[PDB]
């Protein structure tokens, strides 16, 4: 239901026609003009191709304390707190996952070298037994 | 009024939070299944040729 | 601290512009609680089936996600099975080629 | 988001490019094969035309903007009622003179 | 232009003018019902004047 | 400005924070694909050299029986 980039149910629901991916209106307009492409893949896209999927989302239910101007803004507060509290942790998870990937790549390179070497070992072993 | 808010619907609110937790945790394996597909596809091609 | 809704203290009592600040906070929190009780009455009057619907939608997302999981599991398993069959079709021929070597 | 026919939220939403209405893939499949047209707009609708596709800050700010506008409109009609209750009162304070001077005339 | 206090000060200013408007609600409502009261007594005063004038002319002709 | 401007700029900054977060998720998806390559590939390479060393010691036992004969 959620805009792929957003992750929660769009309040201005829009799919692009060319893609198959439903998007946030303001966000995906910014993004189509921000790289020129479809952010799901990198496909080239234009801003009108957006299709206004609007079936009147108005279902977002007031919770118990959130039903309040003091409450709605306090949860606004901890909400932005949590949005950045997720983004920065994703920054460092990228860093450690990326580091792990680099280590794995180096290990893979070492493995390829060993396989290349051990293959010379076996090929010469067999050519020798042929004598 | 907020007390009765709790008493009446906060059960539905427990249920909704339970469902969003369930859906998020299950997505956390849905996309891991996605990477399972990617790797098994890579090895399909690999052993294949 | 402002939320506790307090009038000017000792060193702020005598000055009336401080009571203008008190007008600000006291009136603001007054209508705070008024539109608060309005929203609460509005949902407990109305909201019940709205929460019904949105919890239904959370369950819908739930089950659709597990459906995606079962599908991905299925297609990936089928691919894996195909790979296993291919592995079998090769290992036998390799083994026999080596024994005839 | 809901299915533009049923009023229940689609489990597997499809979208017809022509009208942009959100439909349920089996439900739109049925209405098209029966009708060949769109159930809300009435244009011709085919089987390939359909693409298979509260606490958060966009909806939260929509809620903020909602309460802002609703408050200001209520107080806008309240502004109107105040100016009403003092136009009538100001003509009343206009007419609180003849009480005095008619009671001086009687 | 927006405060570089970005979420701290953005939230503090959000709340400050939110409650300024919520205060503009209260004083406007307050003078509104104040004037509603003054109008109610003014309508009463009109009716009272009418009673007094009727009594006065009753005294006048008799 | 006050409330429409505040909410507009809040909408903008959430948009920008989320474009950053999707940059995170996109690079992360690239990286987890890189992982699904790498870790599985190193398992496969352990398998490769295992096959090849069994092949080695098999040819070694072949030559060993050969020169046992003569």
TrEMBL record, chain A:
Coiled coil feature spans: 108-131
Domain U-box positions: 1-70
Compartments where located: Nucleus
Assembly notes: Homotetramer.
Biological function: Ubiquitin-protein ligase which is mainly involved pre-mRNA splicing and DNA repair. Required for pre-mRNA splicing as component of the spliceosome.
Family classification: Belongs to the WD repeat PRP19 family.
Protein name as catalogued: Pre-mRNA-processing factor 19
Automatic annotation (TrEMBL), chain B:
Signal peptide positions on this chain: none
Recorded family membership: Belongs to the CEF1 family.
Protein name: Uncharacterized protein
Phylogenetic placement of the source organism: Eukaryota, Viridiplantae, Chlorophyta, core chlorophytes, Chlorophyceae
TrEMBL record, chain C:
Portion of the full sequence shown: 102 to 202 of 303
Protein name, entry field: Pre-mRNA-splicing factor SPF27
Annotated signal peptide: none
Homology family: Belongs to the SPF27 family.
Domain of life, source organism: Eukaryota
Localisation per UniProt entry: Nucleus
Automatic annotation (TrEMBL), chain D:
Keyword Coiled coil: yes
UniProt-annotated location(s): Nucleus
Stated name of the protein: Pre-mRNA-processing factor 19
The species this protein was found in: Chlamydomonas reinhardtii (Chlamydomonas smithii)
Keyword terms of this UniProt record: Coiled coil, DNA damage, DNA repair, mRNA processing, mRNA splicing, Nucleus, Repeat, Spliceosome, Transferase, Ubl conjugation pathway, WD repeat
Signal peptide: none
Boundaries of the shown chain within the full protein: 1 to 118 of 503
Keyword Zinc: no
The U-box domain, residue ranges: 1-58
Primary site of residence: nucleus
Self-association and partners: Homotetramer.
